[PDB]
């Protein structure tokens, strides 16, 4: 039986090979053994054992019933791995940490926390005689009759949803109880019993009972429901909230404007109008969410994101699995701190500047110590936890930490080791750099040879940027020689540009270094030729990807690549100290920004924020004294904003009334940024442009459950090759009333046969992150689902696939598990 696999497993006696055999022996009915071995990137060394163990495991599971199918997996679960540190109980944060002075008698008053827990309170007293430890005191908080209600996170109006909960009885003897539901106006209880009577039940001693209720929502997001438990000991009240959302897919449309009456920065802008547009597929009985924010500076939005909100809100909506997202947490805080410190703008605060400076420094340290989880043994940074080290993310995090070292000191040895690893271990003979992992950071235009050449050029220039940023920590000779070699590579093999993105990144990477070489001037002129300009004199000026797209086509829609190239050109112009050419670019970038201050993706966001901050810091800012008033087109007016340098971080006001919006200004200096976001709900995707072939359905198995199978594939454009896509993300919304089985995803992620890089379950969404989605065939995720409670008329959920670094290339489809016909408030008006 299990001895056959154990022979190989305990005979190879290799740390890496043992795990390969272990996850080769895992059950997998959907794909064959060779297909599983195809994805392994560790090399043949354990590919042989993986194939052998998979074959043996498949053979041994033929004649055995459902008794040894668990014995084998539970015997294989041990002695192959050592352990995984994991606790299943959660303990609340301790209280009463104060330090007092006792003059032989003191009394404090407080309240115990709401938790059925045996609190142990202890005290240590120190004085001139010495130290004494007082006797511990035990105080247990215990409620003998309890009611715990299981409330689903979100529901969609139009469903018959039953919510089920538990009545717990800790009394010794038997007891009969009454349970009561309070009905809110916007929810039909399907009986309208409102007292609403009762159905008395009975529970035994030290037992529990299960009680279910059936309801249906009418309004949206009704967070006020009461449950009453009335027993021999009286009546207890329990308050619960329910979040109801409409049908469709959330869609956000953003629009910005920059206002400057004096026209110092190129143009005069006193009035801007955003129309109240109602799209075709607006969900009935759903108001369109509109929010307006006004800030008194270009970096005013970043200041609002960092300072106005105590916690650092994430600028984007991307998943946090990758190390890049965890690193993104520090960038806005750093740029705010850099602007404040270098501009010496500590006088904006009314409180003590030193305390806020120390708090911001501690937040920087927080981010700095949060990124540390991804360091490997050789001080090289891995993209995912336990994955292979990548030079791309190593250079990126090296640049960011070299920035952070300006205000918060870094470990010199760590940066030295990382910077000497990325130079010695991975670098060509001619000066180029090789990637180690398969973390594709960008999909590049052209055919396969052109794709490889542009990938090499982009990676080399990116690494040069990082090294030139983090040189100050560890200035050495070998790394300087490698940097010079890479600079020579860029200089000699950049000019025959294939894509303007690589040309722009190479130009920026060269600008930080030697700017006297004539080839750099030729590169700069070639970049300057490709500029697209709107307005005469130039008011908008930007770049894009120009291989065969040199026809004048401005869709006016910002894309991650477009913003990235524009930001790199902006940084090159700033570093060359050219101000007359730069005003339209900063105007466009300031108009491009979103609510929180973060652009479409991460790598464009960091570069754009750096460009705006450096432009504000270099071009000296003007005194802020300005009057801005926003009013609806036909409806009444709205709050009027009078901003000085003492007040520009005003609270963001949501647009309540429905009308076209007009923002007007008087005579005043400075710059103002006005950004309007529009969150709306849609019922279809036919209008959108899809770029991924998708198909998701539900199957049934044989204890038997339901299974969900989704499949996605890439559709390359005419310019792109057929190698696939870059790092991609698949999002599956789940229908209300069911949950996703975590064991299947843990199997699909935590093995050497990883079909995906990371998985997570947040807010009723299953999010998976993968290195590449093939274009030739379909790649499919498959997992069981569990029915949490019975629901009826359930609304369909969504299935989205999008590239990580350019979310524009996305495709969404509506799907549902099953829909079969089922009088109690069923018709929702």
């Amino acid at each position, epitope marked *: 039986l299990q001895k056959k696999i154990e022979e190989i497993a305990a005979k190879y006696k290799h740390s890496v090979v043992k795990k390969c055999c272990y996850d080769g022996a895992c059950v997998n009915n959907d794909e064959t053994c060779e297909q599983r071995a195809a994805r392994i990137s560790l090399g043949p060394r354990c590919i042989k054992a993986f194939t052998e163990c998979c074959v043996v495991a498949s053979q041994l599971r033929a004649n055995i019933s459902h008794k040894d199918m668990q014995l084998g997996r539970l015997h294989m679960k041990t002695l192959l791995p050592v352990s995984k540190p994991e606790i299943r109980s959660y303990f609340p944060e301790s209280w009463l940490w104060e330090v007092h002075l006792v003059p032989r008698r003191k009394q404090l008053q407080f309240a115990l926390p709401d938790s059925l827990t045996t609190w142990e309170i202890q005290g240590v007293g120190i004085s001139n005689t010495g130290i004494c430890v007082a006797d511990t005191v035990k105080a247990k908080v215990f409620k003998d009759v309890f009611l715990e209600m299981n409330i689903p996170y979100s529901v969609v109006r139009g469903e018959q949803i039953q919510l089920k909960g538990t009545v717990y009885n800790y009394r*010794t*003897s*038997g*007891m*009969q*109880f009454c349970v009561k539901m309070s009905a809110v106006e916007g929810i039909c209880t399907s009986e309208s019993p409102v007292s609403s009577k009762c159905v008395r039940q009975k529970v035994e*001693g030290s037992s529990s009972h299960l009680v279910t209720f059936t309801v249906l929502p009418l309004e949206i997001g009704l967070h006020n429901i009461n449950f009453s438990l009335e*027993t*021999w*000991f009286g009546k207890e009240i329990l308050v619960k909230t329910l979040r109801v959302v409409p049908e469709g897919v959330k869609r956000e449309s953003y629009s910005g404007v920059t206002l400057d009456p004096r026209g110092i920065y190129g143009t005069i802008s006193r009035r801007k109008e955003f129309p109240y547009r109602i799209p075709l597929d607006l969900v009935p009985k759903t108001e369109i969410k509109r929010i307006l924010s006004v800030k008194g500076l270009l970096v005013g939005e970043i200041l609002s994101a960092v300072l106005s909100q105590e916690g650092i809100n994430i600028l984007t909506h991307l998943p946090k699995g990758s190390a890049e997202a965890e690193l993104m947490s520090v960038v806005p805080v750093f740029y705010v701190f850099h602007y404040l410190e270098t501009g010496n703008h500590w006088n904006i605060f009314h409180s003590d500047p030193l305390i806020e400076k120390q708090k911001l420094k501690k937040k920087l340290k927080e981010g700095m110590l949060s990124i540390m989880s991804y360091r490997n043994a050789d001080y090289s940074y891995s993209v995912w936890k336990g994955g292979s080290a990548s030079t791309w993310l190593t250079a990126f995090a090296l640049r960011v930490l070299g920035q952070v070292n300006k205000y918060v000191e870094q470990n010199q040895n760590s940066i030295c080791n990382s910077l000497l690893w990325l130079v010695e271990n991975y670098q060509l003979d001619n000066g180029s750099f090789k990637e180690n992992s398969q973390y594709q950071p960008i999909k590049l235009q052209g055919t396969l040879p052109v794709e490889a050449r542009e990938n090499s050029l982009y990676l080399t220039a990116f690494t040069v940027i990082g090294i030139r940023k983090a040189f100050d920590i560890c200035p050495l000779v070998k790394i300087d020689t490698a940097l010079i070699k890479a600079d020579n590579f860029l200089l000699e093999n950049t000019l025959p540009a294939q894509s303007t993105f690589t040309l722009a990144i190479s130009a920026y990477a060269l600008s930080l270094g030697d700017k006297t070489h004539p080839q750099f001037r030729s590169i700069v002129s070639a970049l300057k030729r490709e500029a697209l300009v709107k307005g005469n004199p130039p008011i908008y000026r930007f770049w894009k990807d120009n291989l065969q797209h040199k026809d004048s086509s401005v869709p006016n829609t910002g894309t991650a690549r477009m913003v990235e190239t524009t930001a790199y050109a902006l940084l090159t112009s700033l570093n060359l100290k050219d101000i007359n050419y730069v005003n339209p670019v900063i105007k466009w970038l300031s108009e491009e920004q979103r609510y929180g201050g973060g652009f479409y993706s991460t790598q464009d966001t960091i570069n754009a924020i750096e460009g705006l901050t450096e432009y504000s810091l270099l071009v000296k800012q003007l005194r802020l004294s300005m009057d801005i008033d926003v009013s609806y087109k036909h409806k009444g007016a709205l709050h009027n904003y009078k901003m000085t340098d003492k007040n520009f971080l005003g609270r963001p006001v949501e647009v309540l009334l429905n009308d076209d919006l007009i923002v007007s200004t008087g005579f005043g200096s400075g710059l103002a940024t006005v950004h309007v976001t529009t969150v709306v709900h849609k019922t279809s995707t036919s209008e959108e442009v899809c770029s991924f072939y998708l198909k998701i359905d539900t199957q049934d198995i044989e204890s038997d459950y339901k299974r969900i199978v989704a499949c996605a594939s890439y559709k390359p454009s005419r310019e792109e090759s057929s190698s696939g896509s870059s790092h991609a993300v698949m999002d599956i919304s789940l229908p209300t009333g069911i949950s996703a089985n975590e064991e299947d995803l843990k199997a699909l992620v935590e093995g050497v046969d990883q079909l995906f890089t990371d998985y997570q379950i947040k807010d009723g969404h299953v999010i998976l992150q993968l290195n590449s989605i093939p274009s030739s065939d379909f790649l499919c995720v498959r997992f069981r689902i569990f029915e949490l409670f019975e629901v009826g008329f359930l609304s369909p959920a969504t299935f989205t696939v999008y590239e990580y670094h350019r979310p524009d290339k996305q495709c969404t489809m509506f799907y549902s598990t099953s829909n079969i016909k089922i009088c109690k408030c069923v018709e929702a008006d």
Partner: nanobody, 127 residues
């Protein structure tokens, strides 16, 4: 089989006192709630009081608050309803009942709960 025997009762004058007992047998005594009821001639049955054995907490039926007092005996399985200050309202044949489940209080002992009932004892008070 469970069995409840009512003892006591008799004829009294207005303002007197009397002691009644309900001997219980055939069940686990510490897991029951025991109730005293009354049924006047020509009137519907009414609940009077209840005692929860497992903890000793009491319930008196509103109008008879403080008038009486219920106390059980764990040794001989007999509850005693201390009928003090016998005002002439009672004039009933009070029964004793047992139930494994404590009631909800609130609304009260009424709606004729309890599953095991005794024969009752007649109590008469003259004006």
């Amino acid at each position: 089989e469970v069995q409840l025997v009512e003892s006591g009762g008799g004829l009294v004058q207005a303002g007197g006192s009397l002691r009644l007992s309900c001997a219980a047998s055939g069940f686990t005594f510490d897991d029951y709630a025991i109730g005293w009821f009354r049924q006047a001639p020509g009137k519907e049955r009414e609940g009077v009081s209840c005692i929860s054995t497992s903890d000793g907490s009491t319930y008196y039926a509103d109008s008879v608050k403080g008038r009486f007092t219920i106390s059980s005996d764990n040794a001989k399985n007999t509850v005693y309803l201390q009928m003090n200050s016998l005002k002439p309202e009672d004039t009933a044949v009070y029964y004793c009942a047992a139930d494994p489940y404590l009631p909800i209080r609130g609304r009260g002992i009424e709606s004729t709960d309890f599953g095991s009932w005794g024969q009752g004892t007649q109590v008469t008070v003259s004006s």
